[PDB]
Structure formats: structure tokens, C-alpha cells
PDB file of all heavy atoms in Angstrom:
ATOM      1  N   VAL C   1      93.900  60.022  37.273  1.00  0.00           N
ATOM      2  CA  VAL C   1      94.210  58.494  37.179  1.00  0.00           C
ATOM      3  C   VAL C   1      93.148  57.841  36.418  1.00  0.00           C
ATOM      4  O   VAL C   1      91.979  58.058  36.630  1.00  0.00           O
ATOM      5  CB  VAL C   1      94.298  57.907  38.643  1.00  0.00           C
ATOM      6  CG1 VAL C   1      94.751  56.455  38.531  1.00  0.00           C
ATOM      7  CG2 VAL C   1      95.279  58.699  39.491  1.00  0.00           C
ATOM      8  N   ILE C   2      93.500  57.066  35.356  1.00  0.00           N
ATOM      9  CA  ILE C   2      92.648  56.265  34.612  1.00  0.00           C
ATOM     10  C   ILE C   2      93.083  54.823  34.549  1.00  0.00           C
ATOM     11  O   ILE C   2      94.241  54.563  34.113  1.00  0.00           O
ATOM     12  CB  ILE C   2      92.467  56.835  33.206  1.00  0.00           C
ATOM     13  CG1 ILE C   2      93.851  57.286  32.661  1.00  0.00           C
ATOM     14  CG2 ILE C   2      91.479  57.958  33.132  1.00  0.00           C
ATOM     15  CD1 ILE C   2      93.741  57.926  31.286  1.00  0.00           C
ATOM     16  N   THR C   3      92.233  53.890  34.977  1.00  0.00           N
ATOM     17  CA  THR C   3      92.683  52.484  35.081  1.00  0.00           C
ATOM     18  C   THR C   3      91.591  51.624  34.442  1.00  0.00           C
ATOM     19  O   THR C   3      90.371  51.811  34.669  1.00  0.00           O
ATOM     20  CB  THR C   3      92.782  52.087  36.554  1.00  0.00           C
ATOM     21  OG1 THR C   3      91.539  51.923  37.141  1.00  0.00           O
ATOM     22  CG2 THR C   3      93.559  53.091  37.338  1.00  0.00           C
ATOM     23  N   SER C   4      92.051  50.687  33.616  1.00  0.00           N
ATOM     24  CA  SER C   4      91.201  49.717  33.016  1.00  0.00           C
ATOM     25  C   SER C   4      90.761  48.682  34.061  1.00  0.00           C
ATOM     26  O   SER C   4      91.371  48.588  35.126  1.00  0.00           O
ATOM     27  CB  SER C   4      91.813  49.054  31.807  1.00  0.00           C
ATOM     28  OG  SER C   4      93.065  48.451  32.194  1.00  0.00           O
ATOM     29  N   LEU C   5      89.762  47.909  33.722  1.00  0.00           N
ATOM     30  CA  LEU C   5      89.252  46.903  34.603  1.00  0.00           C
ATOM     31  C   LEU C   5      90.100  45.605  34.627  1.00  0.00           C
ATOM     32  O   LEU C   5      89.606  44.562  35.049  1.00  0.00           O
ATOM     33  CB  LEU C   5      87.819  46.554  34.293  1.00  0.00           C
ATOM     34  CG  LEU C   5      86.758  47.410  35.041  1.00  0.00           C
ATOM     35  CD1 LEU C   5      85.349  47.085  34.583  1.00  0.00           C
ATOM     36  CD2 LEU C   5      86.905  47.091  36.545  1.00  0.00           C
ATOM     37  N   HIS C   6      91.292  45.639  34.140  1.00  0.00           N
ATOM     38  CA  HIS C   6      92.282  44.567  34.200  1.00  0.00           C
ATOM     39  C   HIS C   6      92.442  44.187  35.704  1.00  0.00           C
ATOM     40  O   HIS C   6      92.560  45.042  36.561  1.00  0.00           O
ATOM     41  CB  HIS C   6      93.660  45.073  33.655  1.00  0.00           C
ATOM     42  CG  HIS C   6      94.698  43.976  33.613  1.00  0.00           C
ATOM     43  ND1 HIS C   6      94.650  42.913  32.654  1.00  0.00           N
ATOM     44  CD2 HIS C   6      95.785  43.767  34.335  1.00  0.00           C
ATOM     45  CE1 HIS C   6      95.738  42.171  32.900  1.00  0.00           C
ATOM     46  NE2 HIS C   6      96.438  42.636  33.857  1.00  0.00           N
ATOM     47  N   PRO C   7      92.456  42.870  36.042  1.00  0.00           N
ATOM     48  CA  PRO C   7      92.498  42.475  37.375  1.00  0.00           C
ATOM     49  C   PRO C   7      93.787  42.788  38.046  1.00  0.00           C
ATOM     50  O   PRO C   7      94.791  43.029  37.390  1.00  0.00           O
ATOM     51  CB  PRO C   7      92.179  40.971  37.332  1.00  0.00           C
ATOM     52  CG  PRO C   7      92.380  40.567  35.889  1.00  0.00           C
ATOM     53  CD  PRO C   7      92.776  41.760  35.129  1.00  0.00           C
ATOM     54  N   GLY C   8      93.796  42.765  39.361  1.00  0.00           N
ATOM     55  CA  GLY C   8      94.978  43.292  40.112  1.00  0.00           C
ATOM     56  C   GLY C   8      95.142  44.723  39.952  1.00  0.00           C
ATOM     57  O   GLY C   8      96.284  45.245  39.947  1.00  0.00           O
ATOM     58  N   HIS C   9      94.031  45.487  39.895  1.00  0.00           N
ATOM     59  CA  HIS C   9      94.107  46.970  39.805  1.00  0.00           C
ATOM     60  C   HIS C   9      93.818  47.670  41.090  1.00  0.00           C
ATOM     61  O   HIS C   9      94.269  48.738  41.347  1.00  0.00           O
ATOM     62  CB  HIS C   9      93.107  47.429  38.728  1.00  0.00           C
ATOM     63  CG  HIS C   9      91.674  47.376  39.171  1.00  0.00           C
ATOM     64  ND1 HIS C   9      90.935  46.200  39.194  1.00  0.00           N
ATOM     65  CD2 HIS C   9      90.854  48.377  39.649  1.00  0.00           C
ATOM     66  CE1 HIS C   9      89.777  46.450  39.630  1.00  0.00           C
ATOM     67  NE2 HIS C   9      89.651  47.738  39.897  1.00  0.00           N
ATOM     68  N   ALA C  10      93.090  46.979  42.061  1.00  0.00           N
ATOM     69  CA  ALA C  10      92.917  47.574  43.374  1.00  0.00           C
ATOM     70  C   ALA C  10      94.256  47.733  44.110  1.00  0.00           C
ATOM     71  O   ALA C  10      94.391  48.669  44.842  1.00  0.00           O
ATOM     72  CB  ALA C  10      91.905  46.680  44.181  1.00  0.00           C
ATOM     73  N   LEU C  11      95.121  46.782  43.895  1.00  0.00           N
ATOM     74  CA  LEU C  11      96.512  46.919  44.429  1.00  0.00           C
ATOM     75  C   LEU C  11      97.119  48.243  43.989  1.00  0.00           C
ATOM     76  O   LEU C  11      97.706  48.968  44.786  1.00  0.00           O
ATOM     77  CB  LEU C  11      97.332  45.675  44.100  1.00  0.00           C
ATOM     78  CG  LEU C  11      98.832  45.817  44.298  1.00  0.00           C
ATOM     79  CD1 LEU C  11      99.168  45.857  45.750  1.00  0.00           C
ATOM     80  CD2 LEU C  11      99.557  44.693  43.610  1.00  0.00           C
ATOM     81  N   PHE C  12      97.077  48.527  42.710  1.00  0.00           N
ATOM     82  CA  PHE C  12      97.570  49.694  42.151  1.00  0.00           C
ATOM     83  C   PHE C  12      96.838  50.972  42.614  1.00  0.00           C
ATOM     84  O   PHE C  12      97.441  51.960  43.013  1.00  0.00           O
ATOM     85  CB  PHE C  12      97.599  49.641  40.579  1.00  0.00           C
ATOM     86  CG  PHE C  12      97.968  50.963  39.900  1.00  0.00           C
ATOM     87  CD1 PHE C  12      99.315  51.243  39.773  1.00  0.00           C
ATOM     88  CD2 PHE C  12      96.966  51.781  39.435  1.00  0.00           C
ATOM     89  CE1 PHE C  12      99.621  52.470  39.157  1.00  0.00           C
ATOM     90  CE2 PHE C  12      97.314  52.988  38.776  1.00  0.00           C
ATOM     91  CZ  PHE C  12      98.639  53.306  38.616  1.00  0.00           C
ATOM     92  N   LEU C  13      95.502  50.847  42.620  1.00  0.00           N
ATOM     93  CA  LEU C  13      94.665  51.956  43.079  1.00  0.00           C
ATOM     94  C   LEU C  13      94.976  52.347  44.524  1.00  0.00           C
ATOM     95  O   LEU C  13      94.826  53.559  44.879  1.00  0.00           O
ATOM     96  CB  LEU C  13      93.178  51.604  42.980  1.00  0.00           C
ATOM     97  CG  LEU C  13      92.406  51.923  41.707  1.00  0.00           C
ATOM     98  CD1 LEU C  13      92.022  53.444  41.704  1.00  0.00           C
ATOM     99  CD2 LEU C  13      93.185  51.562  40.482  1.00  0.00           C
ATOM    100  N   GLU C  14      95.386  51.417  45.388  1.00  0.00           N
ATOM    101  CA  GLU C  14      95.738  51.739  46.747  1.00  0.00           C
ATOM    102  C   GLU C  14      97.175  52.084  46.919  1.00  0.00           C
ATOM    103  O   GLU C  14      97.555  52.876  47.774  1.00  0.00           O
ATOM    104  CB  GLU C  14      95.343  50.542  47.634  1.00  0.00           C
ATOM    105  CG  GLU C  14      93.807  50.390  47.719  1.00  0.00           C
ATOM    106  CD  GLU C  14      93.019  51.527  48.454  1.00  0.00           C
ATOM    107  OE1 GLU C  14      93.725  52.270  49.099  1.00  0.00           O
ATOM    108  OE2 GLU C  14      91.814  51.524  48.286  1.00  0.00           O
ATOM    109  N   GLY C  15      98.122  51.430  46.120  1.00  0.00           N
ATOM    110  CA  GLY C  15      99.522  51.850  46.197  1.00  0.00           C
ATOM    111  C   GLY C  15      99.740  53.256  45.792  1.00  0.00           C
ATOM    112  O   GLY C  15     100.629  53.933  46.352  1.00  0.00           O
ATOM    113  N   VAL C  16      99.024  53.744  44.803  1.00  0.00           N
ATOM    114  CA  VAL C  16      99.141  55.144  44.404  1.00  0.00           C
ATOM    115  C   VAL C  16      98.834  56.035  45.605  1.00  0.00           C
ATOM    116  O   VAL C  16      99.645  56.990  45.837  1.00  0.00           O
ATOM    117  CB  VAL C  16      98.195  55.432  43.133  1.00  0.00           C
ATOM    118  CG1 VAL C  16      97.778  56.912  43.181  1.00  0.00           C
ATOM    119  CG2 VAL C  16      98.854  55.077  41.866  1.00  0.00           C
ATOM    120  N   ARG C  17      97.752  55.802  46.279  1.00  0.00           N
ATOM    121  CA  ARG C  17      97.351  56.667  47.387  1.00  0.00           C
ATOM    122  C   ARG C  17      98.312  56.521  48.509  1.00  0.00           C
ATOM    123  O   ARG C  17      98.640  57.527  49.213  1.00  0.00           O
ATOM    124  CB  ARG C  17      95.875  56.358  47.751  1.00  0.00           C
ATOM    125  CG  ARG C  17      94.833  56.755  46.725  1.00  0.00           C
ATOM    126  CD  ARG C  17      93.588  56.040  46.994  1.00  0.00           C
ATOM    127  NE  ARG C  17      92.953  56.249  48.248  1.00  0.00           N
ATOM    128  CZ  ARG C  17      92.204  57.329  48.483  1.00  0.00           C
ATOM    129  NH1 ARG C  17      92.007  58.261  47.600  1.00  0.00           N
ATOM    130  NH2 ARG C  17      91.749  57.449  49.719  1.00  0.00           N
ATOM    131  N   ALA C  18      98.790  55.334  48.806  1.00  0.00           N
ATOM    132  CA  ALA C  18      99.752  55.115  49.869  1.00  0.00           C
ATOM    133  C   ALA C  18     101.005  55.904  49.678  1.00  0.00           C
ATOM    134  O   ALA C  18     101.519  56.671  50.546  1.00  0.00           O
ATOM    135  CB  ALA C  18     100.008  53.640  50.118  1.00  0.00           C
ATOM    136  N   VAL C  19     101.563  55.785  48.422  1.00  0.00           N
ATOM    137  CA  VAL C  19     102.828  56.427  48.078  1.00  0.00           C
ATOM    138  C   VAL C  19     102.655  57.950  48.134  1.00  0.00           C
ATOM    139  O   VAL C  19     103.451  58.696  48.570  1.00  0.00           O
ATOM    140  CB  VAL C  19     103.378  55.937  46.787  1.00  0.00           C
ATOM    141  CG1 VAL C  19     104.646  56.757  46.337  1.00  0.00           C
ATOM    142  CG2 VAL C  19     103.787  54.462  46.901  1.00  0.00           C
ATOM    143  N   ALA C  20     101.463  58.456  47.571  1.00  0.00           N
ATOM    144  CA  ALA C  20     101.177  59.859  47.575  1.00  0.00           C
ATOM    145  C   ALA C  20     101.090  60.384  48.995  1.00  0.00           C
ATOM    146  O   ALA C  20     101.479  61.511  49.252  1.00  0.00           O
ATOM    147  CB  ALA C  20      99.861  60.105  46.859  1.00  0.00           C
ATOM    148  N   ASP C  21     100.553  59.546  49.894  1.00  0.00           N
ATOM    149  CA  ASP C  21     100.561  59.955  51.301  1.00  0.00           C
ATOM    150  C   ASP C  21     101.957  60.044  51.916  1.00  0.00           C
ATOM    151  O   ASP C  21     102.260  60.923  52.667  1.00  0.00           O
ATOM    152  CB  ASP C  21      99.716  59.013  52.151  1.00  0.00           C
ATOM    153  CG  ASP C  21     100.009  59.077  53.630  1.00  0.00           C
ATOM    154  OD1 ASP C  21      99.465  59.984  54.329  1.00  0.00           O
ATOM    155  OD2 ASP C  21     100.735  58.186  54.124  1.00  0.00           O
ATOM    156  N   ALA C  22     102.810  59.141  51.469  1.00  0.00           N
ATOM    157  CA  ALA C  22     104.154  58.948  52.086  1.00  0.00           C
ATOM    158  C   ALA C  22     104.939  60.264  51.911  1.00  0.00           C
ATOM    159  O   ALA C  22     105.691  60.644  52.831  1.00  0.00           O
ATOM    160  CB  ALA C  22     104.893  57.782  51.522  1.00  0.00           C
ATOM    161  N   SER C  23     104.854  60.921  50.743  1.00  0.00           N
ATOM    162  CA  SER C  23     105.688  62.027  50.399  1.00  0.00           C
ATOM    163  C   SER C  23     105.126  63.238  51.141  1.00  0.00           C
ATOM    164  O   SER C  23     104.064  63.263  51.790  1.00  0.00           O
ATOM    165  CB  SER C  23     105.675  62.350  48.924  1.00  0.00           C
ATOM    166  OG  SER C  23     106.576  61.456  48.236  1.00  0.00           O
ATOM    167  N   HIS C  24     105.952  64.276  51.231  1.00  0.00           N
ATOM    168  CA  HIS C  24     105.630  65.591  51.868  1.00  0.00           C
ATOM    169  C   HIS C  24     104.869  66.554  51.117  1.00  0.00           C
ATOM    170  O   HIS C  24     104.074  67.303  51.662  1.00  0.00           O
ATOM    171  CB  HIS C  24     106.977  66.231  52.367  1.00  0.00           C
ATOM    172  CG  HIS C  24     108.090  66.222  51.288  1.00  0.00           C
ATOM    173  ND1 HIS C  24     108.179  67.240  50.348  1.00  0.00           N
ATOM    174  CD2 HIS C  24     109.051  65.380  51.025  1.00  0.00           C
ATOM    175  CE1 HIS C  24     109.182  67.000  49.604  1.00  0.00           C
ATOM    176  NE2 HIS C  24     109.699  65.867  49.957  1.00  0.00           N
ATOM    177  N   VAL C  25     105.083  66.511  49.771  1.00  0.00           N
ATOM    178  CA  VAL C  25     104.334  67.503  48.945  1.00  0.00           C
ATOM    179  C   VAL C  25     102.845  67.316  48.954  1.00  0.00           C
ATOM    180  O   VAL C  25     102.346  66.262  49.336  1.00  0.00           O
ATOM    181  CB  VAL C  25     104.855  67.456  47.466  1.00  0.00           C
ATOM    182  CG1 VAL C  25     104.226  68.423  46.595  1.00  0.00           C
ATOM    183  CG2 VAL C  25     106.375  67.675  47.455  1.00  0.00           C
ATOM    184  N   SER C  26     102.099  68.341  48.783  1.00  0.00           N
ATOM    185  CA  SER C  26     100.669  68.429  48.930  1.00  0.00           C
ATOM    186  C   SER C  26      99.953  67.238  48.205  1.00  0.00           C
ATOM    187  O   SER C  26      99.145  66.511  48.724  1.00  0.00           O
ATOM    188  CB  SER C  26     100.075  69.775  48.539  1.00  0.00           C
ATOM    189  OG  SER C  26     100.346  70.077  47.236  1.00  0.00           O
ATOM    190  N   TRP C  27     100.342  67.076  46.870  1.00  0.00           N
ATOM    191  CA  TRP C  27      99.760  66.070  46.038  1.00  0.00           C
ATOM    192  C   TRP C  27      98.257  66.180  45.936  1.00  0.00           C
ATOM    193  O   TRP C  27      97.545  65.273  46.330  1.00  0.00           O
ATOM    194  CB  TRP C  27     100.202  64.663  46.463  1.00  0.00           C
ATOM    195  CG  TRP C  27     101.650  64.372  46.302  1.00  0.00           C
ATOM    196  CD1 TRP C  27     102.531  63.816  47.163  1.00  0.00           C
ATOM    197  CD2 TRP C  27     102.401  64.502  45.069  1.00  0.00           C
ATOM    198  NE1 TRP C  27     103.803  63.698  46.625  1.00  0.00           N
ATOM    199  CE2 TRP C  27     103.713  64.037  45.324  1.00  0.00           C
ATOM    200  CE3 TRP C  27     102.081  64.922  43.806  1.00  0.00           C
ATOM    201  CZ2 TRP C  27     104.725  64.126  44.381  1.00  0.00           C
ATOM    202  CZ3 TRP C  27     103.121  64.907  42.826  1.00  0.00           C
ATOM    203  CH2 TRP C  27     104.433  64.495  43.157  1.00  0.00           C
ATOM    204  N   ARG C  28      97.806  67.252  45.340  1.00  0.00           N
ATOM    205  CA  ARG C  28      96.352  67.555  45.147  1.00  0.00           C
ATOM    206  C   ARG C  28      95.885  66.910  43.833  1.00  0.00           C
ATOM    207  O   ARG C  28      96.243  67.426  42.850  1.00  0.00           O
ATOM    208  CB  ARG C  28      96.204  69.092  45.213  1.00  0.00           C
ATOM    209  CG  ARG C  28      95.392  69.651  44.052  1.00  0.00           C
ATOM    210  CD  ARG C  28      94.952  70.994  44.621  1.00  0.00           C
ATOM    211  NE  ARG C  28      94.344  71.849  43.622  1.00  0.00           N
ATOM    212  CZ  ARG C  28      93.317  71.547  42.936  1.00  0.00           C
ATOM    213  NH1 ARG C  28      92.650  70.350  43.110  1.00  0.00           N
ATOM    214  NH2 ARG C  28      92.811  72.394  42.100  1.00  0.00           N
ATOM    215  N   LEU C  29      95.077  65.846  43.913  1.00  0.00           N
ATOM    216  CA  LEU C  29      94.669  65.012  42.805  1.00  0.00           C
ATOM    217  C   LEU C  29      93.261  65.383  42.351  1.00  0.00           C
ATOM    218  O   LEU C  29      92.435  65.779  43.153  1.00  0.00           O
ATOM    219  CB  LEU C  29      94.700  63.552  43.187  1.00  0.00           C
ATOM    220  CG  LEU C  29      93.665  62.948  44.203  1.00  0.00           C
ATOM    221  CD1 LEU C  29      93.605  61.463  43.987  1.00  0.00           C
ATOM    222  CD2 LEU C  29      94.097  63.296  45.580  1.00  0.00           C
ATOM    223  N   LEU C  30      93.016  65.267  41.052  1.00  0.00           N
ATOM    224  CA  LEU C  30      91.771  65.778  40.465  1.00  0.00           C
ATOM    225  C   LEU C  30      90.642  64.693  40.473  1.00  0.00           C
ATOM    226  O   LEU C  30      89.643  64.822  41.100  1.00  0.00           O
ATOM    227  CB  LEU C  30      91.975  66.353  39.118  1.00  0.00           C
ATOM    228  CG  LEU C  30      92.241  67.786  39.074  1.00  0.00           C
ATOM    229  CD1 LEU C  30      93.647  68.200  39.692  1.00  0.00           C
ATOM    230  CD2 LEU C  30      92.144  68.354  37.671  1.00  0.00           C
ATOM    231  N   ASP C  31      90.934  63.522  39.766  1.00  0.00           N
ATOM    232  CA  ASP C  31      89.931  62.548  39.767  1.00  0.00           C
ATOM    233  C   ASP C  31      90.542  61.164  39.372  1.00  0.00           C
ATOM    234  O   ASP C  31      91.675  61.125  38.837  1.00  0.00           O
ATOM    235  CB  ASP C  31      88.813  62.889  38.719  1.00  0.00           C
ATOM    236  CG  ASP C  31      89.394  63.517  37.446  1.00  0.00           C
ATOM    237  OD1 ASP C  31      90.615  63.773  37.440  1.00  0.00           O
ATOM    238  OD2 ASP C  31      88.652  63.781  36.534  1.00  0.00           O
TER     239      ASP C  31
END
């Protein structure tokens, strides 16, 4: 995941992790 410092990015940074948790697949993330 690569995110610029554009505001309203913490929402995206946490939605990614929430949705990744929601699914069943392992979803092993690197950085």
C-alpha cells in the first residue's frame, strides 16, 4: 500500500484493513 499525504487518507488506511479483516482469505500484506 502506498498513500500520499492527501487529507482524508486515514479513513482509507483504516477501511483497507477493516475490509481485509472482513473477508475469509488470509490476506497477508507486505508493507
Side-chain angles (χ1 to χ4, degrees):
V1 185
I2 39 181
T3 76
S4 57
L5 269 176
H6 183 75
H9 74 283
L11 168 67
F12 172 82
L13 268 283
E14 296 289 346
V16 152
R17 291 158 61 81
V19 174
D21 163 78
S23 281
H24 43 88
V25 179
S26 58
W27 289 130
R28 130 160 172 58
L29 70 159
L30 267 70
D31 41 355

